[PDB]
Design a protein around this motif. Structure first.
Motif, PDB file in Angstrom:
ATOM      1  N   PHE A 110      45.832 -13.176  22.919  1.00  0.00           N
ATOM      2  CA  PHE A 110      47.256 -12.950  23.124  1.00  0.00           C
ATOM      3  C   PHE A 110      47.547 -13.162  24.600  1.00  0.00           C
ATOM      4  O   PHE A 110      46.909 -12.541  25.455  1.00  0.00           O
ATOM      5  N   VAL A 111      48.501 -14.035  24.903  1.00  0.00           N
ATOM      6  CA  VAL A 111      48.822 -14.392  26.277  1.00  0.00           C
ATOM      7  C   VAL A 111      50.321 -14.252  26.483  1.00  0.00           C
ATOM      8  O   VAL A 111      51.112 -14.821  25.724  1.00  0.00           O
ATOM      9  N   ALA A 112      50.707 -13.506  27.509  1.00  0.00           N
ATOM     10  CA  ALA A 112      52.099 -13.367  27.903  1.00  0.00           C
ATOM     11  C   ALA A 112      52.327 -14.165  29.176  1.00  0.00           C
ATOM     12  O   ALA A 112      51.550 -14.057  30.127  1.00  0.00           O
ATOM     13  N   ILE A 113      53.387 -14.961  29.188  1.00  0.00           N
ATOM     14  CA  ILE A 113      53.702 -15.839  30.302  1.00  0.00           C
ATOM     15  C   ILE A 113      55.145 -15.590  30.706  1.00  0.00           C
ATOM     16  O   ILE A 113      55.937 -15.042  29.934  1.00  0.00           O
ATOM     17  N   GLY A 114      55.484 -15.974  31.929  1.00  0.00           N
ATOM     18  CA  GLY A 114      56.867 -15.921  32.350  1.00  0.00           C
ATOM     19  C   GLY A 114      57.072 -15.682  33.826  1.00  0.00           C
ATOM     20  O   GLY A 114      56.440 -14.802  34.413  1.00  0.00           O
ATOM     21  N   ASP A 115      57.954 -16.465  34.438  1.00  0.00           N
ATOM     22  CA  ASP A 115      58.387 -16.164  35.790  1.00  0.00           C
ATOM     23  C   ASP A 115      59.155 -14.854  35.789  1.00  0.00           C
ATOM     24  O   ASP A 115      59.884 -14.540  34.845  1.00  0.00           O
ATOM     25  N   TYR A 116      58.998 -14.080  36.855  1.00  0.00           N
ATOM     26  CA  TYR A 116      59.565 -12.743  36.820  1.00  0.00           C
ATOM     27  C   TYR A 116      61.050 -12.810  37.138  1.00  0.00           C
ATOM     28  O   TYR A 116      61.567 -12.011  37.923  1.00  0.00           O
ATOM     29  N   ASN A 117      61.745 -13.756  36.506  1.00  0.00           N
ATOM     30  CA  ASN A 117      63.190 -13.876  36.656  1.00  0.00           C
ATOM     31  C   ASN A 117      63.705 -14.672  35.456  1.00  0.00           C
ATOM     32  O   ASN A 117      63.672 -15.903  35.473  1.00  0.00           O
ATOM     33  N   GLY A 118      64.182 -13.964  34.433  1.00  0.00           N
ATOM     34  CA  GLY A 118      64.954 -14.570  33.369  1.00  0.00           C
ATOM     35  C   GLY A 118      64.193 -15.158  32.196  1.00  0.00           C
ATOM     36  O   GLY A 118      64.787 -15.330  31.128  1.00  0.00           O
ATOM     37  N   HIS A 119      62.909 -15.478  32.335  1.00  0.00           N
ATOM     38  CA  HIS A 119      62.193 -16.185  31.281  1.00  0.00           C
ATOM     39  C   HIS A 119      60.879 -15.492  30.959  1.00  0.00           C
ATOM     40  O   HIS A 119      60.252 -14.879  31.824  1.00  0.00           O
ATOM     41  N   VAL A 120      60.464 -15.612  29.698  1.00  0.00           N
ATOM     42  CA  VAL A 120      59.261 -14.951  29.209  1.00  0.00           C
ATOM     43  C   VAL A 120      58.851 -15.612  27.903  1.00  0.00           C
ATOM     44  O   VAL A 120      59.687 -16.152  27.177  1.00  0.00           O
ATOM     45  N   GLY A 121      57.555 -15.576  27.612  1.00  0.00           N
ATOM     46  CA  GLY A 121      57.033 -16.126  26.378  1.00  0.00           C
ATOM     47  C   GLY A 121      55.754 -15.425  25.978  1.00  0.00           C
ATOM     48  O   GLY A 121      55.043 -14.857  26.810  1.00  0.00           O
ATOM     49  N   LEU A 122      55.458 -15.489  24.683  1.00  0.00           N
ATOM     50  CA  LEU A 122      54.278 -14.860  24.114  1.00  0.00           C
ATOM     51  C   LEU A 122      53.572 -15.862  23.217  1.00  0.00           C
ATOM     52  O   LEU A 122      54.223 -16.624  22.500  1.00  0.00           O
ATOM     53  N   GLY A 123      52.245 -15.867  23.262  1.00  0.00           N
ATOM     54  CA  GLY A 123      51.486 -16.796  22.451  1.00  0.00           C
ATOM     55  C   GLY A 123      50.198 -16.220  21.908  1.00  0.00           C
ATOM     56  O   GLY A 123      49.493 -15.488  22.605  1.00  0.00           O
ATOM     57  N   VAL A 124      49.881 -16.536  20.657  1.00  0.00           N
ATOM     58  CA  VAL A 124      48.679 -16.052  19.991  1.00  0.00           C
ATOM     59  C   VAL A 124      47.910 -17.255  19.477  1.00  0.00           C
ATOM     60  O   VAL A 124      48.464 -18.078  18.740  1.00  0.00           O
ATOM     61  N   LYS A 125      46.638 -17.358  19.850  1.00  0.00           N
ATOM     62  CA  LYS A 125      45.823 -18.475  19.386  1.00  0.00           C
ATOM     63  C   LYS A 125      44.431 -17.999  19.013  1.00  0.00           C
ATOM     64  O   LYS A 125      43.815 -17.229  19.747  1.00  0.00           O
ATOM     65  N   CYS A 126      43.929 -18.475  17.877  1.00  0.00           N
ATOM     66  CA  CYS A 126      42.611 -18.106  17.381  1.00  0.00           C
ATOM     67  C   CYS A 126      41.726 -19.343  17.339  1.00  0.00           C
ATOM     68  O   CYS A 126      42.142 -20.390  16.834  1.00  0.00           O
ATOM     69  N   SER A 127      40.514 -19.222  17.876  1.00  0.00           N
ATOM     70  CA  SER A 127      39.595 -20.349  17.969  1.00  0.00           C
ATOM     71  C   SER A 127      38.159 -19.844  17.935  1.00  0.00           C
ATOM     72  O   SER A 127      37.896 -18.645  18.016  1.00  0.00           O
TER      73      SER A 127
END
Ligand SMILES: [Mg+2]
Ligand SMILES: [Mg+2]
Ligand SMILES: [Mg+2]
Ligand SMILES: [Mg+2]
Ligand SMILES: [Mg+2]
Ligand SMILES: [Mg+2]
Ligand SMILES: [Mg+2]
Ligand SMILES: [Mg+2]
Ligand SMILES: [Mg+2]
Ligand SMILES: [Mg+2]
Ligand SMILES: [Mg+2]
Ligand SMILES: [Mg+2]
Ligand SMILES: [Mg+2]
Ligand SMILES: [Mg+2]
Ligand SMILES: [Mg+2]
Ligand SMILES: [Mg+2]
Ligand SMILES: [Mg+2]
Ligand SMILES: [Mg+2]
Ligand SMILES: [Mg+2]
Ligand SMILES: [Mg+2]
Ligand SMILES: [Mg+2]
Ligand SMILES: [Mg+2]
Ligand SMILES: [Mg+2]
Ligand SMILES: [Mg+2]
Ligand SMILES: [Mg+2]
Ligand SMILES: [Zn+2]
Lengths: 82, 213, 132, 129, 82, 71, 99, 22, 218
Positions: I69-86
């Motif tokens: 589980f990876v959370a990404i985003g500039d700390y101004n206005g934007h954000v995203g979440l991603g789940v990947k299994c490998s």
RNA sequence: AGAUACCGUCGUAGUUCCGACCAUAAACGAUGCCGACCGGCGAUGCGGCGGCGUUAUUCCCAUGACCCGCCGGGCAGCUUCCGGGAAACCAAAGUCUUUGGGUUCCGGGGGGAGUAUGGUUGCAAAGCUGAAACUUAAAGGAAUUGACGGAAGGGCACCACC
RNA sequence: UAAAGUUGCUGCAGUUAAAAAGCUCGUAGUUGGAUCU
């Protein structure tokens, strides 16, 4: 659906609906003017009459009670009032 | 239509409609198609209001003309009834045809060979072309569908009511949609009858081709 | 079992789609063509590919094949599909019309049509399949 | 049996708005219902409505603009003083920028901001935002 | 959008569905923005501008997109009365 | 559902206390049997006389002798 | 977890259904639940039909039929292969087998 | 043990207890 | 070197789309991470929330895969979440980062009381749900910080919210559902119809209409 | 192997009726009752309202039997991205953190235990009410993969058979 | 004491996880349709 005018119902579907479920409830019954085969003079009769209406000016039976609308005697004519 | 006399249905168009049998729907009525039928014949068959069909056809043509890239319209037919009509429509207008089987992922999977990104989708039968219809719901793709009386309207934005069961009716609507978009674009005049005649869009019915030869 | 493997079939399909002009119904010319235009490291594989190419040439001779897609062939196919009858099937002197669609046309303002022939309606309201 | 006609009216309009419909019919109608619909009017959440006079109890056809997120009732109709109004709006409203609590005071039926202006408390009826 | 100072502090202003007035979200890929080419009143030809409508995914899923677009075009004069 | 009327305070309170009696911790703390049975008698600590040293077997997954005393 | 919406029977709108007996094992089973099969079969099988017809005294006698209603309890129906188990989706199909 | 037979055994034990404290 | 495949990628690379908000306006799906890297590459940070081994039972043993589980985003206005299994942890993290970049949503920020300064908190109370986990964000006064559990706090700080109250219900021990629920609540911030957005929308031209010819010749 | 059983033979109480007790069931839709709103579709039972056209009849209206619709109350069914739910699934188990229509019963980790005791009902069997000491890190629900089956189907092999 | 929305007024649950009385009637209790400037 969605944009359907409930303020201006169409007459056909307003009659289609149940009497109590209309915009304003209007009864389905009416009053009839019944003429006997021989008697010259008319009688006012309820459409859904629950009593055996006798001719006031004779002995003829005018209508017979049923489940819904009353059954006029054969030959006895009728006209809708109003 | 827009109440314009120059875009009003003519006697010849009505005669072609009646000859092709477009007004003859089916024995079942979808509740979202009720505002397109006239009444129900005593054979159980519904009759489609041809004026309203003309209006929906004109609206679909207006939507088609509103795309600057003529090749960015996707015209799809899965049943053999409309494959020839779809190919002729693509050749006449400039759209991109998909006649035959629609491979799932054509709109979503960008690695696939046939991957494309249309701006308008036209289908012959929402029931038989359900896969492109639901795939369009993933890529913000407006849809135009030729709908019968029992045609579901999910993910259909402009529905043209007609009989989409008979070969003549389907061919006739594809031919007139091509005629309308060409006339709106600027090619072809509205006074000279169109050279291409609707029989070119009709399904050939191979047993009929064998008798033809 | 003489079932060809996907190697043979895909190779033959690509060869046909690329070099349809040079090919024909002869196995012994097709195999030479294949060995000239392709690099098949085995003679048996070359023979299998040529045999399937011959089979597919015979197949395309009497129509189309779901695997092949020849650009020049499609033009001739649509040329055959461009058949146009002398008289349009929609041009009829008299077309039958039910009273209901006649009333609909009258409401459309097209009640002055002359080709319409108002046929009699059905009598029995029996259009449903019996249940059971 | 049916009690608190206002709850039924608010449920009907809420369900119609969730469904995306442009008009909703409410029955039975009442003067409390009309006053609540009018305070919803003056803030632009509802739109124009029309009262149908059946001789028993009227119906209301309400035009709907998609600006209504929620409208509901608070039963029982608890008595609210000026001190507790802040707690009530903290509980019910989604923000301090928008949303209204409706109450009956002796001054009439109005939102909580007007009640603050008039310095009157009352009984809570419902809310809308 | 507006603070007390007066400038618009907002990343962007999303579109609203022209049928239901709902906000069309950033990631809602069933929504569409149709353009319809209106026609001149004399020659019956496309003249260059157009009228645009936007529908959210929910309305399209319910199947009400067709009726909504029909009514939006009718109110714009694109579709003739009746 | 629960009663919600303006005059339902007594019903709500009585129901709450009756149902409170069904909570394990509340019943343990307020019934008085736990305090009676507690060897410490509610005290934090206690003082005792060592009776004998005993070795107690540890529970099955781990083997050991725990050195305890009877007091 | 519930396996069937109808609970494996056809009891809707009533409280009790009269018990019946399995023709094989004589088990009390509710009538709606029991699996019922109507067998119409020639009294004489096709193997002996020719012998019976040759040895008859009438012309075009038409051999009589036998009409038996068999009632089976679920266990007997499964054991006798009258009914089989199906997949979770195939269970919903109420159409009788073509046969 | 099946719940029904556990209840049956408990009822037998209760009967014995009642008969013993006559 | 990036060679775009989608129309949106070609438009973005060719200096035709000037902002990610133009893509958000038309709700266009973003299928190339190079778009996000091009628009917010400098300011983006990632954070591996959790690595979970999942197992599939087989005739011989358990086949183990790893879910990141990876959370990404500039700390101004934007954000995203991603789940990947490998099968490999590093591959899983790389894929989760790509997916988190593909899932960047805009965040709407408002004021608690007075509208002085930049927005600092959520516009209104919002709720996200994912499998029995309910997360509620409440507007908070300036300077209050983020009152939340660590897992939602990471995403809330990454989005750009400075002050926020939080209430969570359900089985928050499942980090995936907790993160997806707070992500859902964050995403709902621009779908709430507040009165300031009541103004009738003015429709502009989509990028596919504005740059039809450039796409035709490229 | 053993059978205080499954199978078979006989067979008491009972099974049947009347009069008094008993008041318990997986007494189940394992889903309180009243009221409102929220999608479609085809059937079905009862009642009423219409409509060509066939039948009883032979002609009369009838009134029955069909056929095509409508309305209302029911037993249900299919379908659906209504919305819910852990999910199975549910058009209610929806209109719930955007949390308040009215109201009754009732649950609070698993055991000890529906046990002991007291009360009460009953001829009795038993019913209703109903603990604690102590013990324990799980017990449990849906769903996914395998493994297994004395379950059902196919397929293969002269290390199977013919 | 908070965590415990695991006592739930705010604010919990009762098809399958613990859970709706076997069913109906019925006193107290609780709640109770428009309408009057
Ligand atoms: Mg089982
Ligand atoms: Mg009943
Ligand atoms: Mg029973
Ligand atoms: Mg909690
Ligand atoms: Mg836990
Ligand atoms: Mg023995
Ligand atoms: Mg025996
Ligand atoms: Mg019991
Ligand atoms: Mg029970
Ligand atoms: Mg009937
Ligand atoms: Mg009739
Ligand atoms: Mg019915
Ligand atoms: Mg609640
Ligand atoms: Mg009760
Ligand atoms: Mg317990
Ligand atoms: Mg006792
Ligand atoms: Mg009791
Ligand atoms: Mg299970
Ligand atoms: Mg505490
Ligand atoms: Mg708390
Ligand atoms: Mg709980
Ligand atoms: Mg249980
Ligand atoms: Mg019950
Ligand atoms: Mg009472
Ligand atoms: Mg009152
Ligand atoms: Zn049996």
């Amino acid at each position: 659906p969605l944009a359907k005018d409930l303020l201006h119902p169409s007459p056909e579907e307003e009659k289609r609906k149940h009497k109590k479920k209309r915009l304003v409830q209007s009864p389905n019954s009416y009053f009839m003017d019944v003429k006997c085969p021989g008697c010259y003079k008319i009688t006012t009769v309820f459409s859904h009459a629950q009593t055996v209406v006798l001719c006031v000016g004779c002995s003829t039976v005018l209508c017979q009670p049923t489940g819904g609308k009353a059954r006029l005697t054969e030959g006895c004519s009728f006209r809708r009032k109003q | 239509s827009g109440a314009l006399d120059v875009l009003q249905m003519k006697e010849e168009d009505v005669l072609k409609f009646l000859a092709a049998g477009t007004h003859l729907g089916g024995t079942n009525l979808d509740f979202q198609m009720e505002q397109y039928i006239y009444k129900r014949k005593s054979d159980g068959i519904y009759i489609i209001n041809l004026k309203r069909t003309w209006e929906k056809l004109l609206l679909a043509a207006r939507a088609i003309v509103a795309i600057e890239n003529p090749a960015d319209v996707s015209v799809i037919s899965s049943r053999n009834t409309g494959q020839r009509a779809v190919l002729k429509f693509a050749a006449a207008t400039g759209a991109t045809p998909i006649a035959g089987r629609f491979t799932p992922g054509t709109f979503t999977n960008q690695i696939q060979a046939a991957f494309r990104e249309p701006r308008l989708l036209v289908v012959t039968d929402p029931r038989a072309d359900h896969q492109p219809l639901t795939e369009a719901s993933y890529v913000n793709l407006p849809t135009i569908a030729l709908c019968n009386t029992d045609s579901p309207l999910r993910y259909v934005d402009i529905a043209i009511p007609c009989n989409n069961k008979g070969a003549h009716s389907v061919g006739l609507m594809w031919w007139m949609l091509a005629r309308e978009v060409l006339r709106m674009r600027g090619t072809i005049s509205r006074e000279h009858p169109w050279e291409v005649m609707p029989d070119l869009y009709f399904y050939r019915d191979p047993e009929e081709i064998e008798k033809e030869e | 079992g003489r079932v060809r493997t996907k190697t043979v079939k895909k190779a033959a399909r690509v060869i046909i789609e690329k070099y349809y002009t040079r090919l024909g119904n002869d196995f012994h010319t097709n195999k030479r063509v294949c060995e000239e235009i392709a690099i098949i490291p085995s003679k048996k594989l070359r023979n299998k590919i040529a045999g399937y190419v011959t089979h597919l040439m015979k197949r395309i001779q009497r129509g189309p094949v779901r695997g092949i897609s020849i650009k020049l062939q499609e033009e001739e196919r649509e040329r055959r599909d461009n058949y146009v009858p002398e008289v349009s099937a929609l041009d009829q002197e008299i077309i039958e019309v039910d009273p209901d669609t006649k009333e609909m046309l009258k409401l459309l303002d097209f009640g002055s049509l002359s080709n319409l022939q108002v046929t009699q309606p059905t009598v029995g309201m029996n259009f449903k399949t019996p249940r059971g | 049996v049916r009690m608190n006609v206002l709850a039924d009216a608010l449920k009907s309009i809420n369900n119609a708005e969730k469904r995306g419909k442009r008009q909703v019919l409410i029955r039975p109608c009442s003067k409390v219902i009309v006053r609540f619909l009018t305070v919803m009017m003056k803030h632009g959440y509802i739109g124009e409505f029309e009262i149908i006079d059946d001789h028993r109890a009227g119906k209301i056809v309400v035009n709907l603009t998609g600006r209504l997120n929620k409208c509901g009732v608070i039963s029982p109709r608890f008595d609210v003083q000026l001190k507790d109004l802040e707690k009530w709006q903290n509980n019910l409203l989604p923000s301090r920028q928008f949303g209204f609590i409706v109450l009956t005071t002796s001054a009439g039926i109005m939102d909580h901001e007007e009640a603050r202006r008039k310095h009157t408390g009352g009984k809570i009826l419902g809310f809308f935002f | 959008m507006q603070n007390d100072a007066g400038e618009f502090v907002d990343l962007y202003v999303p579109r609203k569905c022209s049928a239901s007035n709902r906000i069309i979200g950033a990631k809602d890929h069933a929504s569409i923005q149709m353009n319809v080419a209106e026609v001149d009143k004399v020659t019956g030809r496309f003249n260059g501008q157009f009228k645009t409508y936007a529908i959210c995914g929910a309305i399209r899923r319910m199947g009400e997109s067709d009726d909504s677009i029909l009514r939006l075009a009718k109110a714009d004069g694109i579709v003739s009365k009746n | 559902g629960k009663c919600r009327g303006l005059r339902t305070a007594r019903k709500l309170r009585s129901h709450r206390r009756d149902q409170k009696w069904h909570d394990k911790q509340y019943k343990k703390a307020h019934l008085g049997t736990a305090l009676k049975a507690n060897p410490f008698g509610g005290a934090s600590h206690a003082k005792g006389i060592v009776l004998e040293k005993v070795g107690v077997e540890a529970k099955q997954p781990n083997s050991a002798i725990r050195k305890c005393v009877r007091v | 977890t519930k396996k069937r919406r109808n609970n494996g029977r056809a009891k809707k709108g009533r409280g009790h259904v009269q018990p019946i007996r399995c023709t094989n094992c004589a088990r009390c089973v509710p009538k709606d639940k029991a699996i019922k099969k109507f067998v119409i079969r020639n009294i004489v099988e096709a193997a002996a039909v020719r012998d019976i017809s040759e040895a008859s005294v009438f012309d075009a006698y038409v051999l009589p039929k036998l009409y038996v209603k068999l009632h089976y309890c679920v266990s007997c129906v499964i054991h006798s292969k009258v009914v089989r188990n199906r997949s979770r989706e195939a269970r919903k199909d109420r159409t009788p087998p073509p046969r | 043990m099946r719940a029904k037979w556990r209840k049956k055994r408990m009822r037998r034990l209760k009967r014995k207890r009642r008969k013993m404290r006559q | 070197e990036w060679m775009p495949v989608t129309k949106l990628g070609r438009l973005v690379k060719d200096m035709k789309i000037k902002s990610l908000e133009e893509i958000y306006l038309f709700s266009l799906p973003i299928k190339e991470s190079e778009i996000i890297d091009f628009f917010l590459g400098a300011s983006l940070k990632d954070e591996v929330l959790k690595i979970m081994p999942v197992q599939k039972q087989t005739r011989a043993g358990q086949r183990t895969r790893f879910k990141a589980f990876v959370a990404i985003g500039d700390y101004n206005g934007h954000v995203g979440l991603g789940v990947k299994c490998s099968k490999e942890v590093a591959t899983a993290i790389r894929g989760a980062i790509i997916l988190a970049k593909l899932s960047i949503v805009p965040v709407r920020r408002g004021y608690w009381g007075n509208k002085i300064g930049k927005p600092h908190t959520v516009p209104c109370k919002v709720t996200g749900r994912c499998g029995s986990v309910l997360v509620r964000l409440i507007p908070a006064p300036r300077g209050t910080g983020i009152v939340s559990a660590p897992v939602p706090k990471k995403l809330l700080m990454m989005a750009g919210i400075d002050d926020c109250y939080t209430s969570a219900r359900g089985c928050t021990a499942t980090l995936g559902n907790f993160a997806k629920a707070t992500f859902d609540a964050i995403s709902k911030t621009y779908s709430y119809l507040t009165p300031d957005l009541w103004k009738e929308t003015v429709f502009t031209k989509s990028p596919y209409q504005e740059f039809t010819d450039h796409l035709v010749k490229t």
